[PDB]
Amino acid sequence: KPFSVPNIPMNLMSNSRVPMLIDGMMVSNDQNQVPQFQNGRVTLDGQLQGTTTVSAACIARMRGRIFNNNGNYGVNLAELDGNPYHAFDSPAPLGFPDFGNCDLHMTFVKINPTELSTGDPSGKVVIHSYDATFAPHLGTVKLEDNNELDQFVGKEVVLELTWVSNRTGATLNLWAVPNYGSNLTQASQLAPPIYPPGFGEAIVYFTSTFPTVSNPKVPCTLPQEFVSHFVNEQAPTRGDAALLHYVDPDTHRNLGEFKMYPEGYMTCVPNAGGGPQTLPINGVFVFISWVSRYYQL
Amino acid sequence: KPFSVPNIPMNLMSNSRVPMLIDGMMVSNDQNQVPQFQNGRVTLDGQLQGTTTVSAACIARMRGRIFNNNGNYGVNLAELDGNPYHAFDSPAPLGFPDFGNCDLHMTFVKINPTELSTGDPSGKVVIHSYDATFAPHLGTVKLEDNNELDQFVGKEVVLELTWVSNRTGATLNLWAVPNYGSNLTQASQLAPPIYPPGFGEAIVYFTSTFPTVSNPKVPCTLPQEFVSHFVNEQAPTRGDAALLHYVDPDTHRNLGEFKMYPEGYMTCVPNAGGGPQTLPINGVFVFISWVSRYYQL
Numbered sequence: 001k002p003f004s005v006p007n008i009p010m011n012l013m014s015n016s017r018v019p020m021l022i023d024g025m026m027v028s029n030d031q032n033q034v035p036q037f038q039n040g041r042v043t044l045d046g047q048l049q050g051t052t053t054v055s056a057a058c059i060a061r062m063r064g065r066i067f068n069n070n071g072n073y074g075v076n077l078a079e080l081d082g083n084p085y086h087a088f089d090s091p092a093p094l095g096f097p098d099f100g101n102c103d104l105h106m107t108f109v110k111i112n113p114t115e116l117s118t119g120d121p122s123g124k125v126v127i128h129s130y131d132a133t134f135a136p137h138l139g140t141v142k143l144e145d146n147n148e149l150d151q152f153v154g155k156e157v158v159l160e161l162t163w164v165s166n167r168t169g170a171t172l173n174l175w176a177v178p179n180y181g182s183n184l185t186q187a188s189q190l191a192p193p194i195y196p197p198g199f200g201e202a203i204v205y206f207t208s209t210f211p212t213v214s215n216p217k218v219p220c221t222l223p224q225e226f227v228s229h230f231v232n233e234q235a236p237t238r239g240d241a242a243l244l245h246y247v248d249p250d251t252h253r254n255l256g257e258f259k260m261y262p263e264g265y266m267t268c269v270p271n272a273g274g275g276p277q278t279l280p281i282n283g284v285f286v287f288i289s290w291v292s293r294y295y296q297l
Numbered sequence: 298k299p300f301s302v303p304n305i306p307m308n309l310m311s312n313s314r315v316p317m318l319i320d321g322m323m324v325s326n327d328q329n330q331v332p333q334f335q336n337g338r339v340t341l342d343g344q345l346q347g348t349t350t351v352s353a354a355c356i357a358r359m360r361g362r363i364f365n366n367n368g369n370y371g372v373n374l375a376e377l378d379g380n381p382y383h384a385f386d387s388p389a390p391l392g393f394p395d396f397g398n399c400d401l402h403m404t405f406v407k408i409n410p411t412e413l414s415t416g417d418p419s420g421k422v423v424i425h426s427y428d429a430t431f432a433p434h435l436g437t438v439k440l441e442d443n444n445e446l447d448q449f450v451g452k453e454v455v456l457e458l459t460w461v462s463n464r465t466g467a468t469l470n471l472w473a474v475p476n477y478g479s480n481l482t483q484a485s486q487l488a489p490p491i492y493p494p495g496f497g498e499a500i501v502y503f504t505s506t507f508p509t510v511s512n513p514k515v516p517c518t519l520p521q522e523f524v525s526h527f528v529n530e531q532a533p534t535r536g537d538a539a540l541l542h543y544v545d546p547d548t549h550r551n552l553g554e555f556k557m558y559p560e561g562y563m564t565c566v567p568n569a570g571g572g573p574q575t576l577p578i579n580g581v582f583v584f585i586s587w588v589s590r591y592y593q594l
């Protein structure tokens with residue numbers, strides 16, 4: 001099966017870290033910055049990594065049963081379909097937010113049909129993605145008590161990320177990797193860090209405007225629809241890098257060349273006119289050829 | 298280009314009317330209730346219909362500027378990327394909820410980056426998908442005043458569907474078509490109603506458990522990832538129907554046949570053999586061939 005990337009304009013695809021349309025590309029201020037996102041992680045031959053899911057419907061969501069232990073509230077986590085999280089494959093349940101060291105402002109609803117016959121099933125809560133009480137790898141996270149959790153104790157809910165704020169005393173760092181928790185000898189299951197290629201190349205980030213307050217631009221290393229595309233195709237990786245063109249949807253003019261590496265990320269060589277950030281956002285990526293990892297952009 | 302459907306297990310794909318994993322499929326008990334969903338609508342050759350778009354990140358969301366005029370609040374609608382909604386040109390902005398005659402309980406956030414440097418950008422509001430003031434095709438919907446909208450007047454927000462309840466005096470009808478054009482006009486570019494073809498066939502609905510309170514099972518006529526697949530492929534339609542086999546994900550043994558029609562829905566003959574049988578939810582649809590309308594399931 002021949003390799004390809006989606007024939008969909010970039011601005012119709014979702015961020016892989018929040019369910020939001022992509023509205024830009026950027027390179028990092030520090031071109032040596034190492035991303036280690038846990039969502040949007042897949043190889044070019046379609047092997048999922050981290051907490052990455054096929055569907056954008058799972059991005060930055062949680063599921064589980066709310067508990068109250070001696071005034072300490074929390075969620076006992078499950079996968080989003082309600083089946084148990086076994087921690088065999090991922091550092092947290094699939095889809096789990098990968099924003100670390102910050103305050104996650106969640107909206108949630110009861111999800112058991114028996115709890116959905118009448119009344120308001122909804123609530124909201126803050127979850128800190130820090131401290132030992134944030135241990136999603138071990139199946140539990142602490143909820144901040146907002147005096148409105150008691151009606152939900154013992155109930156199964158699904159939670160979604162509404163907005164994010166900085167932890168007191170810290171900036172909101174969207175490159176931070178959550179400390180998901182360790183379990184004795186068990187593997188972390190983390191998707192690996194991506195080290196910048198150097199030699200003029202820079203990792204390309206796809207961005208979405210989103211209410212990460214104090215830093216309202218969420219970077220990711222692949223659009224979500226690239227992930228499902230690769231999972232669907234399972235195309236053998238026949239070279240060390242894939243040469244892409246980013247093409248005008250109307251004129252079919254090549255607007256810039258990119259390299260995709262087997263690990264599932266893209267680079268460019270930024271030029272005089274600002275890097276990829278200056279490109280129109282309605283272009284279409286097209287696979288041209290397998291090339292050497294040393295191919296010169 | 299040969300037609301195909303996604304090679305993704307059903308239970309990893311999203312509903313096309315709410316952003317939730319599919320947890321089953323079923324035929325309706327009321328064969329007389331006609332589906333005319335506006336989301337999840339696409340032809341097999343990749344032509345989007347109604348309010349349907351490509352990404353699951355857009356499903357059941359709204360965007361626009363909150364206003365207060367003549368003693369009532371509302372939203373002036375835009376497309377989800379912030380570009381203008383071309384009023385009178387599709388039934389409503391793409392992704393707009395297609396639940397009619399009910400109460401849409403929305404969660405929202407300010408989306409202008411200048412409004413996202415500090416503070417809580419979030420709120421919630423109820424929107425009635427009924428009355429003359431529900432006029433999304435004209436560019437506006439009324440918001441119910443909850444005494445917490447003032448700070449948002451003049452601000453651009455994105456809204457997401459958190460839960461749904463019935464309109465007072467009515468039952469919650471998940472097959473109702475919203476009156477998008479109010480009393481002014483029938484909305485243009487409505488995706489058409491669907492009727493079963495005969496030969497014992499019944500329309501198949503993909504289901505998700507979701508807080509549509511009083512009926513927490515949301516039916517749709519295609520998985521969202523089927524929609525993006527067809528848009529991506531643009532495969533010409535070459536027969537009356539596309540025969541699909543729903544196969545075991547590991548052995549590829551056929552578990553049941555389905556016929557997909559060019560209008561973008563599928564049928565089955567349910568209850569084959571009196572039926573003390575249940576299909577699993579983790580099968581994979583595989584395109585077998587184009588077949589005539591007379592192909593007997």
Ligand SMILES: CC(=O)N[C@@H]1[C@@H](O[C@@H]2O[C@@H](C)[C@@H](O)[C@@H](O)[C@@H]2O)[C@H](O[C@@H]2O[C@H](CO)[C@H](O)[C@H](O)[C@H]2O[C@@H]2O[C@@H](C)[C@@H](O)[C@@H](O)[C@@H]2O)[C@@H](CO)O[C@@H]1O
Pocket residue numbers: 117118119120400423462463464465466510511
């Ligand atoms: C038994 C009874 O009449 N309870 C009402 C309550 O209605 C119940 O709960 C709602 C969600 C719905 O499932 C009803 O069928 C059910 O009887 C009222 O809730 C409102 O009900 C109307 C319909 O009659 C609308 O569905 C409306 O959106 C509902 O308000 C929402 O749900 C409420 C529980 C509140 O949270 C409210 O803020 C929401 O907007 C309420 C309110 O009038 O009063 C009784 O509890």
Ligand SMILES: CC(=O)N[C@@H]1[C@@H](O[C@@H]2O[C@@H](C)[C@@H](O)[C@@H](O)[C@@H]2O)[C@H](O[C@@H]2O[C@H](CO)[C@H](O)[C@H](O)[C@H]2O[C@@H]2O[C@@H](C)[C@@H](O)[C@@H](O)[C@@H]2O)[C@@H](CO)O[C@@H]1O
Pocket residue numbers: 103126165166167168169213214414415416417
């Ligand atoms: C002006 C001011 O100091 N307001 C604070 C507020 O902090 C501001 O708003 C938050 C969201 C964030 O942008 C801060 O940088 C900003 O100074 C406080 O909010 C808390 O801020 C801490 C960080 O210092 C956390 O981010 C925390 O999650 C915030 O609480 C949340 O947002 C608040 C506005 C409330 O809505 C609250 O429910 C949220 O938890 C608050 C509370 O300490 O106090 C002032 O309002």
